[PDB]
């Protein structure tokens, strides 16, 4: 059996195309929901250079972090 | 061309027509233009077919 790959014609009637084809799930859904909830909380709360050397802040795809369909 | 593109004020879809009679009146009923491939489809009446054969 391992010598060569058998032709599909013999086992064609075994099953159908995409018999075990399952759709995918979104990634970081919980994190996106948390970001959306925090942003909505801030939104409804809003609606309702010193001489120090270290004063300046430390200034260190296609995924919607906010989780809202623009 | 106007039938297959619709009036300028009322554009049509890819494969559609203003009315069944309007599409069926002309010899051509469907046109598809690829980058170089052309596809056309006629529904020819018997008298028109005989006239074309004679011509």
């Amino acid at each position: 059996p391992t010598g060569e790959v058998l032709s599909l014609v013999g086992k064609l009637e075994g099953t159908r195309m995409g018999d075990k084809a399952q759709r995918t799930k979104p990634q970081m859904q919980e994190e996106r929901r948390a970001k959306r909830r925090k942003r909505d909380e801030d939104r409804h709360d809003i609606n309702k250079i010193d001489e120090t050397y270290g004063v300046n802040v430390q200034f260190e795809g296609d995924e919607d972090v906010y989780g809202e369909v623009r | 061309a106007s039938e297959m593109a619709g009036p300028p004020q009322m554009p049509n879809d890819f494969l559609s027509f203003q009315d069944i009679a309007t599409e069926a009146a002309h010899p051509i009923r469907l046109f598809c233009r690829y980058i170089d491939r052309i596809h056309i489809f006629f529904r020819f009446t018997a008298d028109e077919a005989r006239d074309l054969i004679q011509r």
């Binding site: 159908r16 195309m17 | 690829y34 596809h39």
Partner: protein, 56 residues
């Protein structure tokens, strides 16, 4: 050029139509013309219906 073209005819004589499509040869056959033991066994065909008749 005729040497590199394709024509298909459907009438009382020829019951099928041939399309080359986008590099895929597909033949359309109406159900109202021939039965030939019609059945739903293979997935290589496509079921096409009418808007009003709502039947294959």
């Amino acid at each position: 050029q005729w040497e590199n073209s394709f024509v298909s005819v459907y009438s009382k004589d020829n019951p099928n139509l041939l399309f080359n499509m986008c590099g895929f040869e597909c033949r359309i056959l109406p159900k109202c013309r021939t039965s030939y033991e019609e059945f739903t066994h293979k997935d290589g065909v496509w079921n096409l219906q009418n808007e009003v008749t709502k039947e294959r």
